[PDB]
Amino acid sequence: MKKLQIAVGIIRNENNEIFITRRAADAHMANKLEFPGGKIEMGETPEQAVVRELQEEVGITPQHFSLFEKLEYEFPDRHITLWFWLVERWEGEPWGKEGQPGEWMSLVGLNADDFPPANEPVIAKLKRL
Ligand SMILES: Nc1nc2c([nH]c(=O)n2[C@H]2C[C@H](O)[C@@H](COP(=O)(O)O)O2)c(=O)[nH]1
Numbered sequence: 001m002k003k004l005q006i007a008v009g010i011i012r013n014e015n016n017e018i019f020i021t022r023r024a025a026d027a028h029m030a031n032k033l034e035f036p037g038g039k040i041e042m043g044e045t046p047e048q049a050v051v052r053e054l055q056e057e058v059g060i061t062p063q064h065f066s067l068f069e070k071l072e073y074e075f076p077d078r079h080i081t082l083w084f085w086l087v088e089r090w091e092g093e094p095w096g097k098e099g100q101p102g103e104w105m106s107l108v109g110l111n112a113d114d115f116p117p118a119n120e121p122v123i124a125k126l127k128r129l
């Protein structure tokens, strides 16, 4: 069968709000309010897959780790796996290569609408809260 993995993480900061890449003052799309963790799949392990993206989507040296939640669902042969890593802190500024630089925003009320629907499955459950 065919499978496809994805890993994502909310970058926590001092303020306790997590820097989510969104808008970025006139960018490609305002619906890109997502976080690092794109291309972890490739051919690594559930852990060693994101570990490589973690630095690729942050670049800096942040106290980032742990898994807040992961969405596991398998479609007609083509299965999908989304692993969310609960980040705690980040030194300097996050760069890596996730997307359009975002601002430190409170995760207490993340918006699945303003963010890519590709990750809505997991965020939906919480966002709906
Ligand atoms: N249609 C299609 N989408 C895929 C495949 N593999 C794969 O990771 N994806 C998806 C799932 C991920 O959310 C995202 C990761 O970045 P890419 O699109 O660049 O591979 O794309 C695939 O073989 N076919």
Ligand SMILES: [Mg+2]
Pocket (backbone or CB within 6 Å): 037, 038, 039, 040, 053, 056, 057, 097
């Ligand atoms: Mg990547």
